[PDB]
Design a protein around this ligand. Structure first.
Ligand SMILES: CN1CC[C@@H](c2ccc(F)cc2)[C@H](CO)C1
Length: 282
C-alpha cells in the first residue's frame, strides 16, 4: 500500500502495536559474540543492546578492538551510517578514536546528557573554548571552536587532533536538544528541519566517512533519524515514490543493528516524518 493512506488505515483501526510486533517477529537474528566477551562488559551500556559481529565497527588497536557501534550500509539509497550508544566514562576515548579512524565529518546526538533525572551519556565534548579535552588512552585532543544555540538544536564546531601525527580535522556536532523525556514529539517539523541542517552541512555525503549517530542505546531515536533520511532519499531517486515501503526499509536496516525503532509510537512518528517531509521536498 501507499504510505499516507496505510497510515490513516492503521490509525482508524488502532493496530500500531500489531504492526510493530510483526516487525519484531520478522527481524534478523545474527550473532554478537564479541560484545558478550567478559572483557567487554564495561564497554556496553545495556546488556540487551549489542552490535552484530558481521557489521560491528572495529577499532584499529591490537589489544581490544571492541566498541558498541554498527555500520548500516544502504545499497540502493547509497548512504551509510554508524549507529552507536551514548559514550560511557570508560569509552569516550574509543568514541573519538572511531570518529578519527572512520573519517567521519559529523556527529549527530539525539539525547540530553541527563534525562529523567539520570545520566544518559558522558559529557564527551568540551563546553568552553579555553578548556580543551585530552584522551590519553587514545592520544587525541578535542577543542571547542564555536557554538550556535537555536530553539530546537545546537550546532558546534570542534577540532580533533591526532597527537601522534599532529594532523587536525574539523568535526561538526549536531545536537537535537528537545526530544521529550517521555513519548515522541507531537509534530515532526523540528526533527525534519534538523535532518535538513545535517544534510546541508555535507556530513551525510559520500566524500566523507559515515556520519556517527547516537542517543542513549543507539537504536530508538537513532533508528528514527536514519530511517527517515533513507526513505526520503529513495522517494527522490525512484520513478514511483509511492513504491517506497517503510516497513521493508526498516527490516533491511535491522539486518545491520538489532532493535531499531523501540516502540510503536516511534514507528508511527517515523511514518509521520516521512509523509510530511515528502511534501516539503517538492
Ligand atoms: C542471539 N541469537 C540466538 C540464535 C542464533 C542462531 C543460530 C543458528 C541459526 F540457524 C539461527 C540463529 C543467533 C546467531 O548465533 C544469535
Amino acid at each position: 500500500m501507499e504510505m499516507e493512506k496505510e497510515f490513516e488505515q492503521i490509525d482508524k483501526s488502532g493496530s500500531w502495536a500489531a504492526i510493530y510486533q510483526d516487525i519484531r517477529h520478522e527481524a534478523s537474528d545474527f550473532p554478537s559474540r564479541v560484545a558478550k566477551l567478559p572483557k567487554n562488559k564495561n564497554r556496553n551500556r545495556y546488556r540487551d543492546v549489542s552490535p552484530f559481529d558481521h557489521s560491528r565497527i572495529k577499532l584499529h588497536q591490537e589489544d581490544n578492538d571492541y566498541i558498541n557501534a554498527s555500520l548500516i550500509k544502504m545499497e540502493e539509497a547509497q548512504r551509510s551510517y554508524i549507529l552507536t550508544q551514548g559514550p560511557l566514562p570508560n569509552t569516550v576515548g574509543h568514541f573519538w578514536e572511531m570518529v578519527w579512524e572512520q573519517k567521519s565529518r559529523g556527529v549527530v546526538m539525539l539525547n540530553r546528557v541527563m534525562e529523567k533525572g539520570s545520566l544518559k551519556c558522558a559529557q564527551y565534548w568540551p563546553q568552553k573554548e579555553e578548556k580543551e579535552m585530552i584522551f590519553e588512552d587514545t592520544n587525541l585532543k578535542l577543542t571547542l571552536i564555536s557554538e550556535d544555540i537555536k530553539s530546537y538544536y545546537t550546532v558546534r564546531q570542534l577540532e580533533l587532533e591526532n597527537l601522534t601525527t599532529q594532523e587536525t580535522r574539523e568535526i561538526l556536532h549536531f545536537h537535537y536538544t528537545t526530544w521529550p523525556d517521555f513519548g515522541v514529539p507531537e509534530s515532526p517539523a523540528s526533527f525534519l528541519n534538523f535532518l535538513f541542517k545535517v544534510r546541508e552541512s555535507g556530513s551525510l555525503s559520500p566524500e566523507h566517512g559515515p556520519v556517527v549517530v547516537h542517543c542513549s542505546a543507539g537504536i530508538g531515536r537513532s533508528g528514527t533519524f536514519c530511517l527517515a533520511d533513507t526513505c526520503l532519499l529513495l522517494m527522490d531517486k525512484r520513478k514511483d515514490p509511492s513504491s517506497v515501503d517503510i516497513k521493508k526499509v526498516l527490516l533491511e536496516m535491522r539486518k545491520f543493528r538489532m532493535g531499531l525503532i523501540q516502540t510503536a509510537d516511534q514507528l508511527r512518528f517515523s511514518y509521520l516524518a516521512v509523509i510530511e517531509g515528502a511534501k516539503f521536498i517538492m
